[PDB]
Ligand binder design. Structure first.
Ligand SMILES: *[C@@H](C)[C@H]1/C(=C/c2[nH]c(/C=C3N=C(/C=C4\NC(=O)C(CC)=C4C)C(C)=C\3CCC(=O)O)c(CCC(=O)O)c2C)NC(=O)[C@@H]1C
Ligand SMILES: *[C@@H](C)[C@H]1/C(=C/c2[nH]c(/C=C3N=C(/C=C4\NC(=O)C(CC)=C4C)C(C)=C\3CCC(=O)O)c(CCC(=O)O)c2C)NC(=O)[C@@H]1C
Ligand SMILES: *[C@H](C)[C@H]1/C(=C/c2[nH]c(/C=C3N=C(/C=C4\NC(=O)C(CC)=C4C)C(C)=C\3CCC(=O)O)c(CCC(=O)O)c2C)NC(=O)[C@@H]1C
Ligand SMILES: *[C@H](C)[C@H]1/C(=C/c2[nH]c(/C=C3N=C(/C=C4\NC(=O)C(CC)=C4C)C(C)=C\3CCC(=O)O)c(CCC(=O)O)c2C)NC(=O)[C@@H]1C
Ligand SMILES: *[C@H](C)[C@H]1/C(=C/c2[nH]c(/C=C3N=C(/C=C4\NC(=O)C(CC)=C4C)C(C)=C\3CCC(=O)O)c(CCC(=O)O)c2C)NC(=O)[C@@H]1C
Ligand SMILES: *[C@H](C)[C@H]1/C(=C/c2[nH]c(/C=C3N=C(/C=C4\NC(=O)C(CC)=C4C)C(C)=C\3CCC(=O)O)c(CCC(=O)O)c2C)NC(=O)[C@@H]1C
Ligand SMILES: *[C@H](C)[C@H]1/C(=C/c2[nH]c(/C=C3N=C(/C=C4\NC(=O)C(CC)=C4C)C(C)=C\3CCC(=O)O)c(CCC(=O)O)c2C)NC(=O)[C@@H]1C
Ligand SMILES: *[C@H](C)[C@H]1/C(=C/c2[nH]c(/C=C3N=C(/C=C4\NC(=O)C(CC)=C4C)C(C)=C\3CCC(=O)O)c(CCC(=O)O)c2C)NC(=O)[C@@H]1C
Ligand SMILES: *[C@H](C)[C@H]1/C(=C/c2[nH]c(/C=C3N=C(/C=C4\NC(=O)C(CC)=C4C)C(C)=C\3CCC(=O)O)c(CCC(=O)O)c2C)NC(=O)[C@@H]1C
Ligand SMILES: *[C@H](C)[C@H]1/C(=C/c2[nH]c(/C=C3N=C(/C=C4\NC(=O)C(CC)=C4C)C(C)=C\3CCC(=O)O)c(CCC(=O)O)c2C)NC(=O)[C@@H]1C
Ligand SMILES: *[C@H](C)[C@H]1/C(=C/c2[nH]c(/C=C3N=C(/C=C4\NC(=O)C(CC)=C4C)C(C)=C\3CCC(=O)O)c(CCC(=O)O)c2C)NC(=O)[C@@H]1C
Lengths: 172, 162, 194, 162, 172, 162, 162, 162, 172
């Protein structure tokens, strides 16, 4: 995988160039955001079980066909598989947030996932709906101003939103 | 590429685990180092042309046969001299990548893996490059954390060559 | 040189399955059960099926069998012996490209399909550089092999079926016959009939 | 689905063998059982409503906090009572499937596999369902082989929940 | 895999329904046929060697190009592989007969077998011809009135013939 | 050693599961068969001498050269006749074991595994024994389940030889 | 025993590598954290009796059926109350360890792994322990890095239980 | 293919090695042999019809029952005689291939692999073909290295059948 | 493996006790030495190749028996193995230095090492002599006062020495 730093390095080596002064300044800006990034990862992780379960409950309330007999989330194992998939996706979103690069999410979670769901008959559009619900819960948690040093986390929130959107688009 | 952040996620993923305080501490450790690394990279980059020519001359001084003997692997002609300065430039540039990345990753990926085969195939003495790397350590002018990290990468490359 | 890097892909084996023993759970043939002679037959037959798909009397390795029966070697050693055997080299290595040979090895030894062409590509060079044995040993020593089958269990195709489904993924001995179009052309098949 | 007939074939196939006297004996054991199983399936199905209703009440009585505590996981509103009655109905129905199949197959594939994850994730107590299963055990009024097989499936589920 | 009983269960679960009285009665009728089903499996099994070898003999007599030099059943290994395959198909037909459902035959033998033979250059049409000859012999063995409680096995025989037909269709 | 009881446990143990109704039905299937098998074993045992000597003659009659040709593998002298009667006895005795065990276990363990190697090494024709096994099938005078189970083991050996 | 230091070594060892800047940064990350962790461990240790008694009481208040229902798994008698207070003490004590170790290692090794089986076997509700951990979170009084790290371990246990 | 040139390369390829003096020596071994094998193949081929006819008659004489007994596996009729002469022709022709190739490769690939299954399935006696091979050994009239190599292959097939 | 922290934890857990105030103060004192510990690891690592090759040269000069024909370090493959063993031991000693605990060294380097050497005929006392030479070279590198902030590293140098001594004792 790449992190935010190695992504820039990889591009530089391909051109055979030292990182320009601006590229170094950009990473210095990235470093300055570091605490907010760490806090955001910590906050999503600390609420992972709630995020998944609340999103799942809401998805099934809004899409009852999924849990009716014959529905794709019906039966304990299929329900379990579905909750597992949401937790996996959430986990990889936090990985990409941590590293500051989407490659870990793309290579190790989303690669081939649409093909798997098509083959299995998993409704990809419903998966994307679940991820959106997790996204919305997660971003509220990150932005909660209570119990933290106040500051602007909009940039980090926007990055995380993109990772969630990346996952939802891959499966739907 | 070995960097603190990728290693933290790599470890957690292999265990199928969410990141925890262990991995956050890795991130903080990265954050402690990053600015010095970025500074180190700028200083090395700015003085890069001086370091390369100075390093290359140190090799020529320590192995005078390299500038006197004929052969594709030596530097008796300008063609060989340019190859040599190019190579030393590669070492220096990849080292600055390590300073940016915060780990040996770039050296491993771009330089170390396969170097033994190259030097053997093209009959290039590793000691030549050790001498250049020793010079750069002696003459890059860094201090403190920037010096420590930069030397660690330079020593890593030296150890890889011997 | 380090193995060429490649990314995984979503696969049944990559996620928790919540498995409960059924008629679709692969039978565990292990020597940790102190198997009787007839039961050891079945374990040996299972290994031949896993690696060769079928061992005619010509294919069988009676001395390896005796050594496994006597505890001289583990099941993983027996599996290595089959992979090193004349039958495996002649059937699956010589009749395929390096790329398809790698696929056979991953399917038979690790019990999963390859991730992609890139995985096949990355491992195809190993026989040439590390030698035939180097390839087998790498796979048999891999965390993936050891975590799943260890030293005393015959490998098998993993998580082929999901509960409540009528059919699973194709069995590898159907999906991957010992040779394919490349060798088929050399033999001059298909044969026009009628 | 795990049943005597599918396990017999699974055994023979794992040995590359035609079916033999051993597997034919398995089919006879299936045939000796099947009619009692079908009669039990019929009896439970005819009485499904009162068994499901009674089982839910047994649970509400044993665990009154479930009908009085607010929360998505409890049955203090009609929403929760419906889910609970639904869940109990699932257990009863799938148990009738096991009687038809002659094995735990239907329970394993439709209900048991992954039930721990669900109960953890949605904060449902396994003890609630044990009490329901005990109620159905004590109120299905089967006898003989039908009783013995039916109870084996109810106890199998109870054991899985504890 | 499914058997005759669990096939009905799978359909009922997909609908979230108890088995109807007619479904239960139908399975009871299946149970009353159980002995004939067992006898048919035992009879094919006990004559498996002859069924395969007689069918193979007739196949090579009708299609001599298979065994002439350069043919797909020429050389000892190819001939051995061909005889083996016929026995495999017969074996899985008895499994299907034993279970009363075609799923095991399809999942473990037929699904994908057409591509197998195309990849190898095996004439799938000629395989089907051989399967038909095993079918003919096998049904004759099942219907043999000598040495068995007399009764009507037409229903089971038709089922067996169907499994053979499924196998013959699948290979080519 | 394949029998219904050991196969049931072998399957359950492979799955790491307690015995379920599926395995109990396997046991019921065995119990349905056991007495018929035991009675079949008794009847074969008490008639063993007649069956073996009859079978040997049937082989000599169908394959006259075996009693006319000189060679270690033929029965032209009393030595070869004694070997032949011995072998047929082995087949008969082990078949009675299968009737007792309720499975091909004894045939797999004691006779079938390796028979090909023996017949090839000592130049014995499997066809000889097939004829012997047909005679035993035709003359054991069993009926019902005793006949069906006995014939299936006799046919199992014949198929192993063919 | 997941901690920054052991994971750094195990990673390097798995790769047959000397420690490099990446692992040194991990060490610096651990150092930035350790003192806050030890202070958090000290604070929790000194308040342990109150936290554990309050945690147990908060559980009884939220789940009053626990202190009034007879049964080995409930806290109606003094036996159960002692089991319960002991268990909560374990959570607290092992959490202080995680603060000392700087990772979830102690929770993983001593408490988390296998907790699912325990709670299912003895009919203990994970929600009970979640309630206690929420109480400790709200009443330990920590601020800053000590709070963040301690809450991360408390949350980690909560996630495992749900 | 078991052939000196093929195995030399197979082994070197298996080992990832360039060919070395060991493999060149194998090639010299092949060259020493090749002309004798080619001459042997010519002599066997020129005399092919007589050898096959003589061999079949030898078999019929040693096993007269094969020309007297009805059955698909016997040569009582013209069909079976033609099959038999065909089979023997296969042995001789493939033997000539081994002499051309300098190894048992052709016999292994085209005849021996699977021969056990064929002979068992079609009730063909290996002793029939052994008798025919002994006839060919006795009547090919080769000398020197041609005789030795040719007899090694005939004996190789005899050993495979016994 | 343990590190200096989890060693204390494991002892505390086996008695069901919180870390006493004195135990916590000891670990706090360990934290204050951390930078020196990190420096020592870094200096050893940076000189590893020189440490191994110098020690190897010294060992063979003093024990020419090892490298003459028939000596245990004669032939390239045995020489290479020998040099590898030296580097392995040094690597694990730095692991122990990094974690502040001998467990990694004992569990993952010395586990069965003496047995291996006897089985192979490697002269254990000579390995211990080689280890001793690396120790002296390493400690001088760690204690070097040039190019570093000055302080008292005697507490760590003594700890490192004990890890070398532990290795030398284990190979004999
Ligand atoms: C958006 C994400 C929210 C937000 C974040 C935020 N955090 C800080 C500062 C700090 N946060 C930490 C985090 C931790 N310390 C620990 O010990 C651990 C546990 C292992 C963690 C996760 C730290 C160390 C700091 C620095 C010290 C401090 O407390 O200030 C800031 C301030 C800016 C900065 O760059 O640090 C911000 C903005 N704040 C919000 O209001 C958002 C809801
Ligand atoms: C005995 C080991 C020798 C010694 C060491 C020593 N070091 C320090 C202080 C520091 N050393 C470091 C180390 C690094 N900084 C980096 O960025 C990296 C590279 C990734 C490393 C290895 C640091 C961060 C410090 C603190 C800052 C400083 O500039 O000092 C000390 C002083 C004690 C202290 O930490 O306050 C000592 C004693 N000194 C000797 O005299 C021995 C030869
Ligand atoms: C300089 C210290 C001495 C020297 C140098 C020299 N090098 C070459 C040729 C090559 N050098 C490399 C090295 C690299 N290529 C890479 O991509 C990287 C990593 C980013 C490295 C380190 C390679 C691959 C070659 C061969 C291919 C090429 O042409 O680039 C030469 C010429 C060798 C020849 O035979 O042509 C020379 C002269 N020679 C001296 O005498 C100096 C002391
Ligand atoms: C939940 C919101 C939805 C849902 C999910 C669902 N998924 C499956 C099955 C699988 N999901 C995967 C996923 C992955 N494999 C990987 O390697 C990765 C990255 C690590 C992922 C995310 C796989 C491979 C499977 C099959 C294997 C298995 O399920 O164990 C199912 C089960 C399908 C079935 O028939 O059992 C379900 C239910 N289903 C919904 O209805 C939701 C919209
Ligand atoms: C025949 C003259 C005598 C005889 C032999 C006999 N041996 C065994 C069992 C084994 N024989 C071996 C031998 C080898 N295995 C090897 O790999 C090699 C080296 C290449 C040899 C020499 C072994 C290992 C065994 C045990 C494992 C196995 O069963 O193969 C038996 C079988 C005994 C048993 O079933 O337990 C027999 C019968 N027996 C006699 O009575 C003759 C004097
Ligand atoms: C009844 C004893 C108690 C009770 C029940 C209750 N259950 C849920 C939610 C779910 N129940 C299930 C169970 C199953 N789904 C299946 O597919 C199967 C196998 C066929 C079973 C057994 C599942 C998966 C859920 C979650 C998804 C869904 O809602 O369908 C709830 C609601 C929980 C929530 O958060 O919505 C309730 C209330 N509650 C009590 O208090 C009763 C004593
Ligand atoms: C005989 C009537 C015809 C015939 C057959 C033939 N088949 C093969 C080779 C293979 N057949 C299979 C089949 C299967 N693999 C499976 O997993 C299953 C289900 C359990 C089946 C049915 C496979 C995999 C092969 C190749 C591997 C192997 O042979 O061991 C051959 C030989 C081809 C070769 O050389 O590999 C032949 C001859 N050929 C005819 O001409 C008849 C019409
Ligand atoms: C159908 C193609 C042919 C046929 C079958 C048939 N069988 C029965 C009855 C029985 N057959 C058995 C079989 C066995 N008993 C054993 O112990 C074993 C060995 C393991 C076997 C295979 C049994 C137990 C019965 C029941 C008792 C009896 O002896 O009759 C019937 C009669 C109806 C029934 O369902 O019982 C029939 C029709 N009959 C034909 O004419 C067909 C050629
Ligand atoms: C002659 C010594 C005796 C004899 C021969 C006989 N053979 C068959 C049938 C077959 N023979 C073979 C042999 C081969 N096929 C090959 O491809 C090769 C390798 C290149 C060999 C050696 C095979 C496979 C068969 C069966 C298929 C076919 O018919 O071609 C028969 C007829 C058997 C039958 O049942 O039709 C006979 C008669 N029989 C004697 O009695 C002679 C003493
Ligand atoms: C001669 C061409 C040049 C030269 C030689 C030189 N070699 C060494 C040291 C060693 N040489 C070897 C080589 C071998 N040892 C073996 O066992 C075998 C295989 C049987 C070989 C080929 C080894 C292993 C060493 C190191 C250990 C030892 O000294 O025995 C030296 C000394 C190196 C040192 O640092 O001590 C020298 C001088 N040097 C030149 O300048 C010549 C042009
Ligand atoms: C060098 C100073 C001395 C010396 C060394 C020597 N060792 C071996 C062989 C082995 N050494 C080890 C040790 C380890 N392997 C590991 O992975 C680890 C870490 C857990 C250790 C400590 C092993 C296992 C071997 C055998 C396996 C292998 O591939 O080498 C040799 C080779 C012996 C031989 O070739 O027979 C040698 C020479 N020998 C001396 O004389 C020095 C005192």
């Amino acid at each position: 995988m790449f992190d935010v730093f190695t992504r820039v390095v990889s591009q530089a080596d391909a051109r055979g160039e030292y990182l320009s002064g601006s590229q170094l300044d950009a990473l210095s800006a990235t470093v300055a955001e570091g605490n907010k990034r760490i806090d955001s990862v910590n906050r999503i992780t600390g609420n992972a079980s709630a995020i998944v379960s609340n999103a799942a409950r809401a998805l099934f309330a809004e899409q009852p066909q999924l849990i009716q007999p014959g529905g794709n989330a019906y039966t304990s194992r299929r329900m379990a598989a579905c909750l597992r998939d949401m937790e996996i996706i959430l986990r990889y979103v936090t990985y990409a947030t941590f590293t500051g690069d989407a490659s870990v999410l793309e290579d190790r979670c989303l690669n081939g996932l649409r093909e798997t769901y098509v083959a299995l008959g998993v409704p990809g559009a419903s998966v994307a709906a679940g991820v959106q619900k997790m996204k919305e819960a997660a971003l509220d948690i990150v932005n909660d101003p209570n119990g933290i040093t106040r500051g602007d986390c909009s940039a980090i929130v926007a990055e995380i939103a993109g990772y969630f959107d990346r996952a939802a688009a891959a499966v739907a | 590429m070995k960097t603190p952040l990728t290693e933290a996620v790599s470890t957690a993923d292999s265990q199928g685990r969410f990141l925890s305080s262990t991995e956050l501490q890795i991130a903080f450790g990265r954050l402690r180092q990053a600015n010095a690394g970025l500074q180190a990279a700028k200083a090395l980059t700015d003085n890069a042309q001086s370091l390369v020519n100075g390093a290359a001359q140190a090799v020529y001084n320590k192995f005078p046969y390299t500038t006197q003997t004929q052969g594709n692997n030596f530097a008796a002609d300008q063609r060989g001299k340019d190859k040599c300065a190019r190579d030393i430039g590669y070492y220096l540039r990849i080292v600055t990548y390590c300073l940016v990345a915060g780990g040996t990753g770039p050296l491993d990926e771009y330089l170390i893996a396969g170097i033994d085969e190259i030097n053997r195939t093209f009959d290039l003495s590793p000691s030549w490059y050790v001498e250049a790397l020793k010079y750069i350590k002696a003459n890059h002018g860094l201090s403190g954390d920037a010096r420590d990290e930069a030397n660690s990468y330079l020593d890593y490359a030296i150890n890889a060559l011997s | 040189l380090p193995l060429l890097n490649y990314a995984p892909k979503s696969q049944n084996v990559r996620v928790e399955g919540y498995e409960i023993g059924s008629e679709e759970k692969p039978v565990v043939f292990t020597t940790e059960n102190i198997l009787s002679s007839s039961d050891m037959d079945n374990l040996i037959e299972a290994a031949y099926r896993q690696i060769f798909f079928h061992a005619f009397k010509w294919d069988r390795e009676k001395v390896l069998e005796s050594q496994l029966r006597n505890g001289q070697i583990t099941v993983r050693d027996f599996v290595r012996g089959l992979l090193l055997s004349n039958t495996f080299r002649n059937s699956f290595y010589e009749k395929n490209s390096n790329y398809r040979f790698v696929e056979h090895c991953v399917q038979k030894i690790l019990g999963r399909d390859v991730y992609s062409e890139r995985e096949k590509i990355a491992w195809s060079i190993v026989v040439a550089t590390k030698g035939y044995q180097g390839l087998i040993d790498d796979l048999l020593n891999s965390d993936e092999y050891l975590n799943n089958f260890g030293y005393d269990t015959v490998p098998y195709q993993r998580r082929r079926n999901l509960p409540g489904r009528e059919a699973g993924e194709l069995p590898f001995n159907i999906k991957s016959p010992r040779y394919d179009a490349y060798h088929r052309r050399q033999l001059g098949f298909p044969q026009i009939v009628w």
